[PDB]
């Protein structure tokens, strides 16, 4: 009951999946190769672990996950990893060359071939599970296979899977730092899916996720394993009150629909908090009203976009640890108060509270500190149509001279898809504008 | 390592000893961990029982 | 006047306007504004006033010039990223957007 | 995944005797064949290069070709010339006489036939063939006819499949030959037409980042074939190797090429030191980059500040920081715009290996989409007109049955190369 | 409760606040650890350090403090000093390249790359205050940072704040020891923020503090140690009343109003007895008279400008120790008798008297000397013109030939900027004079 | 807050080595760059002048330009040698021939391409570039052309960043070149615009103060090098160690400079005292102060008693307080108001620093703005229209590009600098 199926699509999927699956492992008391101590007869007492692994025909248990890549070298970095014996030899699913950054291949001719068996593997995942929340998606749109594959692996779930909630975590281009050129025709390609065929999509974008590391972590020289550990963190904070005595549970559904007030409108702004280091750690009296002002202060911020530009629409915090009714509802009245943030006029409610009981976990070589209360904000704002702007004003420039649009027709996609593309973009920021506008 | 722990005691001693004999700072001189050294008045002193919060 | 005041001194002793920044900054906003959302590009080295003058239009703000002798005054218009060197085209741009 | 790489004339197999040196020393392969690592990822992944044999010996996937029999008994007689199978070598009798007509269609039509069956051998004992490698120079006749020769077929049955081509485009300062230019415009065409991307390296500046910036008093052939190895053993290093970013020679090609026919970069390598300055340089990123977008570093002899850059690629390798491998990209981007094209922003495309080559700690390989590739078509292309207009030398091609129009037609199209890469150049948003 | 900022801007402002920080943990039994071992007399919880100290869930009393300097050389020596734990890693934030004594350069260019973070820092320690009395600004008006960026962050905090209190302790160019020539420039330049934002400002200049401690603590070298020292003994007497118990307790408000006659005359002398050394302390009975009248003695005060040639306004005296208020009602009604010092006619009480149970705080190894009771008095009088009225004419001598003009004009500060702040400080010796003259 | 240094000529090159082997013998570095201290101090500010590899050596982050590849041989082969990258020397073919023009316009001009490119490298590899350094002198070729020629392409790249100079101002009274005028003409007006302070050097004062004060027998180049190099490590006192009253190079800059033009000034050391009175001085800071404003300890060749100080700095390093370097200088100040400048109260600017030179302890470094520093502007200007009038020595200037129209500009700039020092001097509140 209450499972989740978690999919990892691409590079980035599958390595912020590794990383979650360290944590998930180590909160739920699982070891890394998955079987039981010899003398136990049963890993684990309780079944709290249920919603993210299922206990096999050994007593062992195997993560409710599908990792997905078209090229073999992450999916056998896992193989052969110290994770090599807990996930499933099958529903790891690799193919024999990758997508190269481009959304037709991943869409069109490495995509569909590979989609129906990774919809194989999720059929059975699903038969697996008896009460199944929904799907749990990572990828980056800046990806070939991320974005193309990730996109068909989307469709065919909602065609498939009927209204079951998609919640998505993607990894947007930065505003400043990129690792492609074609990544704004591939972010742009992809948001035709994820504006459609997905519930409540996630930005964690790579500079903001450095930017909190640097300032708060203290890391001179972060990483992908920090940057996808932070990830992982705001993951198990929003899944948690399902698996763990809370004050206010909070489900899949419960967050996917206090949060988006039209289909369009539902790429949500997420910050996690407090984000500290062990030398900042025990310096900080980190109360409720300190971490909930953190979480709504852009330094916080995990995706580069600054909240003060916009208006807050529904913002959904999931407070962990020791926080008490006590406190988070007056750091919630205290910071209506405050001007910075500004909600439109017709949502004056705004807010959803899910208190959960289980602080977070530490993880070991991690830079986490442990702290006895975090909180995650899920914030849907209107300040997001900034990066879709930057974005599609990259997909202009480049699509002016017709660049790079060769590699997509090769790889078989019509120009009217970047047309269309670049039209839906166009009406998604004129929504966002509209919908911030007063009545 | 063994040896990385002897280095890292090396440069905590190297630290330690950074302000020993004709390097040293006003600061470093005039400014100890000399808390052992002081007798204060701790008779007088708000007890602060009133607090609010919001 | 014989008291030179902060809007005399260059500096807003008032408290700025927020719809300007309840205004989302769209990619209309720059067709119909002039400019680019990609940021500004400046031969600066990280980290230094040069990149943030460049870069962010707080840095370089001025409340009025010199003395005033020679339904306040508000301001909110400083807060964001300064602008890039490209223009937007209307053809870019929706007029019409799908929603209730 | 795994390539197959094919070596062309002299110029060829001399630099993919030592490329597989490279490749063999960085997967932990003995000279003679046997395996002698001490790491599992070298094992990992060995089949990109190599294939297993009968008694666990591991032959290169190479095809070596030279009309000229008597300079592929050097590539035998090399270090590591006991790896490739007899039966990869093919040879004729006579030279290609330095003659382009010869080598693509008079000698070289009748030694291709062996070739082609060794190539196919090759791929259908392959099991997901990632794409044909090739090296050769331009400035030949086997290198230059033969190589294009063998693309061309190559593409009739292989279309969408990756074809490296590390064409060595001659330079007139350390020019050897008079036939120079005809061989280069008559192999520039097919360049373009059959194959997905093909990088410059010249003889020139191999010379001069050997001469100043590693400041060895002797670099020979050898010694400028050695940093053409290193290039393609690091431009292949994430098809055999794990990385925190991986990439493969579609997804950089995806990357570096916007237009069909813009597909010439330039080749640069870091980090190269002389003996004296070892002590005083610092291995950081801080100092790969500046290596990386020197002028100097290039193995091309026109200087990247001529044009603006289309698109570079960083294939950087061993332990670094992800976000400090990003930003110094960020950091260049965002401080030399006139250097690179604004109608496409984030030019610089950066990929992260973990495990870097044999004896090096850190480095990376640059790969640049320049729009300065076009002087050195032009410095050629004066010289080509200058020979063709007193009808210099063309009895030693039209003997061969080559007739003089094909000349013209190479010259038009080596013109419209040029002449899109200035156009893209000026080009304006 | 009774919470209050410490602000430390440029190299003055650190070096005060260094002297001022462990004057009070000397006063609070607080080790550079930031830690309460144990102590007999100290009540189970007694917090009496809330005011400058905020306790930590480490246990720790992480001080209440901002320092701020262009430079890292004083930052970083403060960092690598005797009190790392005691003060956090952040609230002690540096710049990368120092002012160079230009207004403009701190005010316009490298202070603005700073201040947004400043506030920030200010923003997270009053969000910990629920009792916030205001903040005390320690600089040097001769400088570049303290000047400029001083200014700024002023300016920016009498928005942030509104009608807090604001303290600062400012050091002017004195009239014959200053060291740099550009100084009589910052110091007329950073008037504006001093005469509007700044809600009381009192002097500390040098050169009053040197004669002090040459002609009454027998000591031939002083040093900027033993000044701070001073300083830092004035500011905890100053703050003495909010920190003890005391039979007149007395606030920053409570203080402000009495002191402030007219809304920007609030510019005030200090001074200080008895300042007195190992020597000369345990051969003299100290009276409370006898202290009055030598706080009231143009040689113990702090700052160098004789009384005599102006008329006393306000007087606030902030007595410690073992003081009963017969001693300080016989001591003001003998000022009011004796004639060499004058009161204005229009304020007939003219004096306000604040005392405090708990005595002055020795530092041995420093210079001062244990004595039974003290005695601070900040007043407010008309005397206080001469410094102006000589600083302004060495800004005129300076300024009539346009000398040092350029390294102001080139960092983005407009020429009238001088003849703004000279008008403006010209204004300031005109109505001192027209509220001294008599009615 | 680094400093980026750079060597011109042959004197240049000298006081270079000799100013890196002061600074390394501060900061405990051995000529292999390895480092042993006694403290940690040393390494807390070690960057601002050397670079650390990821090995540990320390580098100096120095520029060497000559012409002559000699000089470059010389300053490898000296005790400190090894230090300074082996890259980092820039040579050329052909000495600048004591030729202003040579050294500016044709052969300078070649080389400087070379200088910018490891001149940039090492700028850009600073965290935060707090200035440039440059030691050369106005008589010789190499230093007076090509440095002012590297400060002038610098300026452009360089706007606000601190540009020191030291040029060492040739005297005729030790004269040894007889193109001397001409090139110091030559160059003061480039060095009025490209360098926001800069003061001078005259042997003619070195020797003075080595014969009288030191009392050395022999003073050679060594000492005054060394001398020299003292001060020019004390300058930077307060950047490299803490101190009690911290200042920067853009600090005493804006000081120092009342007006753009107006950034030549006049130095000094202290203390200094012969051998066989060392044990005899009493160290106090008055006597520092006393020598500090003495006429004779000035190290350049122009007395103070002829002129006024428009701005003066004092840097003081070693235990010491404020009055010791505030008091005195008030006691200056009032006793000698004949002697500075009515409309500039408090001319003397002081700073602390808490780490005095090993071997004393403690010690200042003086700088002062005179208005008498335009006494050798006049005598190199009537030097200068001697030569000019009768058209001596031009030829081989303007052979090399250079015209007589850039020597008029030049004396006239000169002899603008010369009245603007002198109404300033006798200008009246
Ligand atoms: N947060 C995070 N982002 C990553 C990570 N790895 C890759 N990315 C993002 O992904 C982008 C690179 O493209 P990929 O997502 O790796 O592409 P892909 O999904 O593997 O698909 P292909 O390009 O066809 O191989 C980078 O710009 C990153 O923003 C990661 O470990 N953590
Ligand atoms: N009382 C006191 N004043 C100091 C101290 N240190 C510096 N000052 C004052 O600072 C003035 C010089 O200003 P600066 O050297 O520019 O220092 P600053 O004001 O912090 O500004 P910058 O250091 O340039 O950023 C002197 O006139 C002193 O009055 C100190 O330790 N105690
Ligand atoms: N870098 C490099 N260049 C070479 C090498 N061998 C030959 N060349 C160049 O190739 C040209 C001769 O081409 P060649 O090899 O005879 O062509 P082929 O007859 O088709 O094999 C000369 O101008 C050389 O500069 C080599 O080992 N390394
Ligand atoms: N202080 C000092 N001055 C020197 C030294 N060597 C040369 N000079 C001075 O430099 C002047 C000549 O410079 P020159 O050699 O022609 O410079 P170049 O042409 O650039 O190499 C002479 O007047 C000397 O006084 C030295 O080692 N120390
Ligand atoms: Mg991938
Ligand atoms: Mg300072
Ligand atoms: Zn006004
Ligand atoms: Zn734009």
Redesign the interface.
């Given at each position: 009951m209450r499972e989740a199926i978690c999919i990892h699509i691409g590079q980035a999927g599958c390595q912020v999946g590794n990383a979650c699956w360290e944590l998930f492992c180590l909160e739920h008391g699982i070891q890394p190769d998955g079987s039981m101590p010899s003398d136990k007869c049963i890993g684990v007492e309780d079944d709290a672990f249920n919603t993210f692994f299922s206990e096999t025909g050994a007593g062992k248990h195997v993560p409710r996950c599908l990792f997905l890549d078209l090229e073999p070298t992450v999916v056998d970095e896992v193989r052969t990893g110290t994770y090599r014996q807990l996930f499933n030899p099958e529903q790891l699913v690799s193919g024999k060359e990758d997508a190269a950054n481009n959304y037709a291949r991943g869409h069109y001719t490495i995509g569909k071939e590979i989609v129906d068996l990774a919809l194989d593997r999720i059929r059975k995942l699903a038969d697996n599970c008896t009460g199944l929340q929904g799907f749990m998606v990572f990828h980056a749109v800046g990806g070939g296979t991320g974005s193309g594959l990730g996109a068909l692996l989307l469709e065919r779930l909602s065609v498939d899977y009927g209204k079951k909630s998609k919640l998505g975590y993607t990894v947007y281009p930065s505003?400043?730092v990129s690792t492609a050129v074609v990544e704004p025709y591939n972010c742009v390609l992809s948001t035709h899916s994820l504006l459609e065929h997905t519930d409540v999509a996630t930005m964690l974008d790579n500079e903001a996720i450095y930017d909190l590391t640097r300032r708060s972590l203290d890391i001179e020289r972060p990483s992908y394993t920090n940057v996808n550990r932070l990830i992982g963190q705001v993951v198990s904070s929003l899944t948690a009150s399902l698996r763990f005595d809370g004050a206010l549970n909070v489900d899949l559904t419960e967050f996917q629909t206090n949060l988006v007030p039209?289909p369009?409108?539902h790429f949500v702004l997420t910050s996690y908090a407090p984000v500290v280091s062990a030398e900042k750690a025990y310096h900080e009296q980190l109360s409720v009203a300190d971490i909930t002002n953190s979480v709504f202060e852009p330094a916080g911020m995990l995706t580069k976009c600054?909240p003060?530009?916009?208006?807050y629409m529904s913002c959904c915090l999931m407070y962990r640890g020791d926080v008490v009714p006590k406190d988070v509802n007056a750091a919630i009245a205290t910071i209506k108060t405050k001007?910075?943030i500004?909600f439109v006029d017709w949502c004056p409610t705004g807010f959803k509270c899910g208190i959960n009981y289980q602080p977070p976990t530490v993880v070991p070589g991690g830079d986490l500190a442990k702290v006895q209360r975090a909180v995650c904000m899920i914030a849907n704002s209107?300040?997001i149509?900034?990066v879709?702007?930057?974005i599609?004003?990259?997909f202009?420039?480049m699509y002016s001279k017709r660049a790079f649009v060769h590699w997509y027709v090769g790889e078989g996609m019509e120009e009217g898809e970047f047309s269309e593309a670049?039209?839906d973009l166009?009406?998604?920021?004129?929504?966002?504008?509209?919908?911030?506008a007063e009545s | 390592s063994q040896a990385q722990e002897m280095a890292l005691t090396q440069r905590d001693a190297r630290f330690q000893t950074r302000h020993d004999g004709k390097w040293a700072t006003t600061y470093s001189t005039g400014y100890q961990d000399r808390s052992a050294e002081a007798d204060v008045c701790h008779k007088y002193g708000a007890k602060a029982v009133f607090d609010i919060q919001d | 006047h014989?008291?030179?005041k902060?809007r005399?001194?260059?500096?807003?002793?008032?408290?700025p306007n927020?719809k300007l920044?309840?205004?989302?900054?769209?990619?209309?906003?720059?067709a119909a504004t002039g400019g680019?959302?990609?940021?500004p590009?400046?031969?600066?080295?990280?980290?230094?006033?040069?990149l943030?003058?460049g870069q962010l239009r707080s840095?370089?703000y001025r409340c009025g010039?010199?003395?005033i002798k020679?339904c306040c005054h508000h301001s909110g218009d400083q807060?964001?990223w300064r602008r890039?060197?490209?223009t937007?085209?209307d053809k870019?741009?929706?007029?019409?957007?799908?929603?209730? | 995944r795994e390539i197959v790489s094919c070596q062309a004339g002299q110029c060829g197999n001399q630099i993919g005797s030592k490329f597989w040196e490279v490749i063999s020393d960085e997967h932990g392969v003995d000279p003679t064949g046997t395996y002698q690592g001490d790491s599992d990822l070298q094992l990992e992944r060995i089949n990109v290069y190599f294939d297993e044999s009968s008694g666990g010996r591991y032959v290169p996937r190479a095809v070596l070709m030279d009309l000229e029999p008597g300079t592929m008994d050097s590539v035998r007689a090399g270090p590591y010339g006991q790896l490739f199978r007899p039966d990869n070598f093919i040879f004729g009798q006579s030279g290609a006489g330095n003659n382009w007509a010869k080598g693509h269609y008079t000698e070289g039509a009748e030694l291709i036939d062996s070739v082609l069956d060794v190539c196919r051998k090759e791929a259908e004992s392959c099991d997901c063939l990632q794409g044909f490698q090739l090296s050769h120079s331009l400035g030949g006749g086997t290198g230059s006819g033969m190589g294009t020769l063998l693309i061309s077929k190559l593409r009739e049955e292989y279309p969408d499949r990756i074809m490296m081509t590390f064409s060595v485009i001659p330079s007139p300062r350390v020019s050897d030959t008079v036939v120079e230019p005809y061989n280069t415009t008559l192999s520039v065409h097919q360049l373009v037409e059959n194959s997905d991307e093909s990088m410059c390296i010249d003889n020139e500046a191999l010379y001069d980042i050997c001469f100043r910036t590693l400041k060895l008093t002797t670099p020979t052939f050898g010694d400028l074939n050695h940093l053409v190895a290193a290039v393609m053993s690091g431009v292949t290093c994430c098809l055999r190797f794990p990385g925190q970013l991986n990439s493969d020679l579609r997804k950089l090609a995806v990357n570096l090429v916007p237009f069909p026919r813009l597909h010439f970069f330039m080749m640069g390598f870091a980090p190269l030191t002389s003996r004296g300055s070892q002590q005083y340089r610092g291995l950081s990123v801080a100092e790969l980059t500046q290596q990386m977008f020197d002028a100097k570093n290039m193995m091309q002899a026109a200087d990247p500040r001529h044009g603006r850059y289309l698109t570079a690629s960083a294939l950087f390798r061993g332990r670094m920081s992800t976000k400090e491998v990003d930003?110094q990209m960020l950091?260049v981007?965002?401080?030399?715009?006139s250097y690179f094209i604004?109608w496409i922003?984030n030019n610089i495309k950066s990929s992260i290996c973990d495990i870097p080559p044999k004896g090096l700690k850190m480095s990376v390989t640059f790969i640049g989409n320049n729009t300065c590739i076009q002087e050195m078509f032009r410095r050629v292309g004066e010289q080509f007109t200058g020979m063709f207009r007193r009808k210099a030398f063309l009895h030693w091609y039209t003997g061969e049955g080559m007739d003089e129009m094909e000349f013209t037609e190479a010259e038009s199209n080596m013109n419209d190369l040029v002449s899109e890469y200035q156009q893209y150049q000026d080009a304006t948003?």
């Open positions: 505003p400043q039209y369009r409108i600054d003060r530009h916009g208006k001007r910075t500004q209107t300040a149509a900034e879709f702007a930057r599609d004003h990259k202009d420039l670049r039209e166009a009406a998604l920021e004129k929504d966002y504008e509209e919908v911030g | - | 014989c008291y030179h902060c005399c001194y260059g500096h807003d002793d008032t408290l927020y920044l309840t205004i989302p900054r769209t990619n209309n906003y720059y680019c959302p990609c940021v590009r400046v031969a600066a080295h990280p980290g230094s006033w040069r943030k003058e840095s370089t010039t010199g003395c020679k807060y964001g890039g060197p490209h937007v085209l870019n741009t929706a007029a019409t957007g799908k929603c209730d | 930003e950091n981007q965002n401080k030399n715009s604004e922003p948003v």
